[PDB]
Design a binder for this molecule. Structure first.
Ligand SMILES: [Zn+2]
Ligand SMILES: [Zn+2]
Lengths: 146, 310, 310, 146, 310, 310
């Protein structure tokens, strides 16, 4: 582990080989405040974890849920003046935006200045992501792969 | 302001049984009494990027039957600025600056809904986007079911042919699964069988369906025989040309048919309904084709008129 | 009989500041108050031998917005009698026997003026002839300058992109060089620099111009940023893809821009104005595209109406 | 701070907004070794920097010089026991493979299973990078502009 | 005289286990000790009505490596060929007048066996006739398996990809079904599955086969892994893409593979064998393609030479 | 072993003054004493992905004059080639399995050097790869200048035409810049001018060059006059045509020319060398084209033969 910041978010127990993806996908990095990332630590169970701390930033509410497909057992801590004023895990959002790519290639998504939007359904088993545009449904495996 | 006014009409899936019904009701009305000037001084885009006979001439004739003017195009080869860099987004941006409504057929799924994000408050009407939606077809298929059968509840409807890639047989099931008492016989090549999702949906609402292998296997139960176009190219020549007596219809078959039964086809056809089916009283696809006008009229009337007090 | 009645509208170069102004004035009027039946019972040819989106759908929508009927074609592949022996002369001879006005886009420079000698007293309207003229575009570019800026005198206008082959950036200079106090910043590849003749003309009237190399070099002086389309094909791939930061516009750039500044593009675009420029309040090309309708309306109103008492 | 390792490499003095870029390009993160990244660190001493620390990992020679187009002033330093056993600063290499993309749109590099290679020639007021394949020379500004 | 001297080679179903052996035998001799003037003074037509340049470059190279002259064409695009009323029968009747052997590839089934009716004493080698046969490909694949595996009896061969439309997997299953103790693993989506006629055939000749869900369950066991081009266009865009996992091979997967195991592909390979596989000792599809020279050579040598001494 | 044995030949920039000499040397020997069975038993693929029939007819003739077999294609029109997912890398990997040398011309830059990564031990000769290299043309031009001028040092060479896009003038200026005392005269419109990278290179290696306005000021001085195809389509119709005078060569002009002077053109020649020039002792562009056989021969001989004895 690594210790204390004040007034910032700390997302702990990211899987391992996932913490960077969250830094990339969710563009958390494009900030002015100190970010610190521990990759391949321990300090809280299941052996492997990355950890990310972004000071003076708070990932208000649907931004935490957007982590659920990648770090569903992550814990997101709201810190103020060296203490955890709150902790929430991610929950499955009704819709995942901007980061996925439609598996179907005759989909209009692929050529246009539109962001992706996938509605989400079924939980902690298969999850089917349906496209905003072509309306086809896919297993999250397929969407979260090639 | 009626419940469809200035609405976009992209997916059957976004319309309620309530809306579906107001569309059929209006169609019926306009069919009984022509209102030649309802849409006077409106200008409507026909944008067929993929080009197409009955839906194009059907909608343009609807626009004329109601008074509107049409500007537009057809394509698949070329005609005007759009292939590189002129994005559909940019094309809709500029055309929604010109007309009062856009009806568009396009090859890529999702195109009319994308259009919806660039047309400001100009509604767009999906004339078909890829293998996805064609809600307009469906509205005339339901008006021809309601009009020959009197209802849209408690029917025995068979779907025959390519039930796998068929854009229309998918939406038509979606829609009929919004009214009570419908039983669905599915007579496709198993190679071309109905997708699982549609059957999963159908299982949810407790709606009865079943696979079948001869049209003759059910040609005594059915009120609607929906006939779809197989496309040669997908199957092997020796594959398609096989299968005992095929999934085609010949008048002979119609011999034990209920009197009220109607054979429907979304059109075009090539071998699947023999010419002899044509002079039988069950034959109803050119009629259905005709009903495209009033159903089409109904939609342009409702999207573009605050309340139709017809 | 207004000063443009039954006139042909072939070159910007044949119109006075006086005429240009009556066109903008009328546009403005029609824009404030629609006259849906001004051109009732007129039939207008759309002849696009070279075919083209916004100018074609813009003019046909104008004809409809005013009451006229359209007959016509688009081409570049084929469609009808004309490639061998059917001379444009013979085609105009016969079409001016049918319609009340011809609007034509053609690939070869000089085509609308040649048309003028075969249309009897049916006016012809140049929708673009080769690399030469496109006076209609220019009229909406000046209506969008007058409409966003309040004047057409004493402006800081930058031309960016291909200032060499650009048909529109040539005419637009021609026209603006008929009003006082305009300064012209020219930001092209030197490879694609403004022709000498245009600069010689500009030197004659004591009008101030200057070459520039960054849009950022003047993006604090300018009221109009006219953005033109470079065409890949002309330059080498490694030639175009070079040049430090290129001649494209990104929203970042707009950070020191005057509030009143507007970015205009004749359309189509491909990479040159990034999508982020779009949600900025400076972005004004889809608007300009829209202004094509009223400007277009204005011209058909004036050419075909003895006096418009609007 | 982000500092006390008993062994490894510490890329100190990374210009701000570049450390993430560096982890992305050079693929520093695909490893199951402890990495501590510090971004937008105080760094008054040199403006505002980023800092990356990988334990039990030593970037040799070729690698530090590959950082030269990105963070030309950074400081690599190795650690073998709990103290700074060496110092390194990026020198501009003769060639840069794998990372840059060719400006030439008709270059074959664009669809084939091949890694880009550019040769580095610091000429006059920038570096010119000639592509392996098409042989076209471009300023690093164009190449990096992408 | 040799058993294949002057024999037409049209289908694998026509050749015997012995014929097969003799061709694989000679392929080996010629690969070891070249015979560059064996077929000096012979001219072979290489008639590719349908263009397919790897089979063709292979065959003409083979013909040149034995001393022969080649005449022919590469149509599909078109030459003065395949049209307006000239039949294949009158076409084959004329070229057989010219050449010593006809190598021909045709778009339609049955064409080389039709060629055979009109070719007089000139032998016809089938280089593919629609979805039907391609013996010469099966032959190189058999020599590749025999060279890498030392045997054509008693092997574990997995068949992956579209086994429905795979004319290559279909002949290799029937060729391999002539030798003994071979176990077949079919790994296709249920949609692109190995036909019943094949499976009948197998069960009838007493051979062990099993359908499997992942390359993965088979890997430990396999000797030959024959990949196949999935026709992306033979499934829906969303159907190809949607699997769960997929049917693509990457180097990782091969970690449990036997030292003797090879990956074989008829090529073009596009999505289905990841390029990291190429660096593996297992990847062998280029070397397979290469064996196309020796098996093809072999053929022409046995068909054109009475008593080949080697 | 010879310095070019088994070397790929991709760019002039890769060859040395010595390598150049050795190739021009051998061209001369072979032109004098033919070697018709030198390359007996070799097969060379001649892969023209882009069709360019004079370079191709030359190369295949050369291959035949040394005893070799040729296999290949002439695509651009199309065969089963260059498309649907087959990469050039998997294409080169298969043909290198077949042939002894790959001669290839490709539409895109860098392709022959990419070919080189996948061709194993098989040598790749570049017959042009987009706007980048064409060594084999530079080589015949150097042997033509060496044969007519007796030397490759210390000459007066004028370069006329489009020097901007001239991939031929660019390599001959870099090849010639390896020998000494050469003076270059560039005579282009300022629009189709000799690039700065070239000029840098020259100034850097200490060489005298000057831009001139007319062929006319140079004529008295010149040794080689190398004409170039102006791409009429790389300028405006009115821009090509408008000069004052032009950049076309007619026999009249040659009256002040030296007895040793030759006019050289890579061909196609269309507007730029008047046919009366052909009757002149100076015209030498057909004879140049002819030297294409010997320089090209030379290449294959040195690349494929260890110790060539002559
Ligand atoms: Zn989609
Ligand atoms: Zn390149």
């Amino acid at each position: 582990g690594v210790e204390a910041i004040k007034r910032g978010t700390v997302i702990d127990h990211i899987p391992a080989q996932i913490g960077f993806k969250l830094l990339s996908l969710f563009k958390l990095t494009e900030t002015d405040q100190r970010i610190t990332i521990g990759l391949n630590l321990p300090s809280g169970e299941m052996g492997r974890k990355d950890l990310i701390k972004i000071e003076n930033t708070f990932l208000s509410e649907d931004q935490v849920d957007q982590l659920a497909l990648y770090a569903p057992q992550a814990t997101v801590n709201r810190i103020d003046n060296y203490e955890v004023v709150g902790k929430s895990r991610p929950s499955l959002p009704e819709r995942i935006d901007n980061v996925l790519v439609c598996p179907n290639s005759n989909c209009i998504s692929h050529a246009e200045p539109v962001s992706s939007s996938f509605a989400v359904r079924k939980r902690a088993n298969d999850i089917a992501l349906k496209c905003k545009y072509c309306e086809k449904e896919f297993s999250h495996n397929v969407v979260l792969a090639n | 302001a009626n419940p469809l006014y200035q609405k976009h009409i992209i997916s059957i899936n976004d319309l309620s049984r309530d809306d579906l019904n107001l569309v059929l009701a209006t169609a019926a009305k306009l069919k009984a009494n022509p209102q030649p000037e309802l849409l006077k001084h409106k200008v409507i885009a026909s944008c067929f990027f993929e080009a197409s006979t009955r839906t194009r001439l059907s909608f343009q004739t609807s626009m004329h039957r109601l008074g509107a003017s049409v500007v537009g195009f057809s394509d698949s080869a070329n005609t005007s600025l759009g292939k590189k860099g002129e994005t559909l987004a940019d094309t809709i941006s500029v055309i929604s600056t010109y007309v009062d409504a856009i009806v568009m057929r396009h090859p890529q799924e999702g195109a009319a809904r994308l259009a919806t994000e660039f047309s400001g408050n100009v509604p767009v009407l999906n004339a078909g986007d890829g293998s996805n939606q064609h809600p307009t077809q469906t509205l005339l298929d339901l008006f021809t079911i309601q009009q020959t059968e009197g209802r849209l509840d408690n029917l025995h409807v068979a779907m025959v042919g390519d039930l796998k890639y068929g854009r229309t047989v998918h939406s038509l099931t979606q829609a009929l699964a919004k009214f009570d008492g419908n039983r669905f016989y599915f007579i496709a090549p198993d190679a071309l069988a109905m997708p699982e999702y549609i059957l999963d949906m159908l299982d949810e609402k407790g709606i009865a369906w079943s696979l079948h292998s001869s049209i003759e296997e059910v040609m005594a139960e059915v009120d609607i025989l929906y006939m779809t176009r197989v496309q040669k190219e997908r199957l092997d020549p020796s594959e398609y040309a096989n299968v005992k007596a095929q999934f085609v219809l010949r008048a002979s078959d119609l011999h034990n048919a209920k009197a009220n039964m109607k054979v429907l086809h979304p059109l075009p056809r090539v071998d699947e309904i023999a010419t002899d089916v044509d002079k039988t009283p069950h034959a109803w696809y050119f009629q259905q084709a005709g009903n495209g006008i009033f159903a089409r009229q109904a939609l342009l009337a409702l999207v573009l008129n605050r309340d139709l007090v017809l």
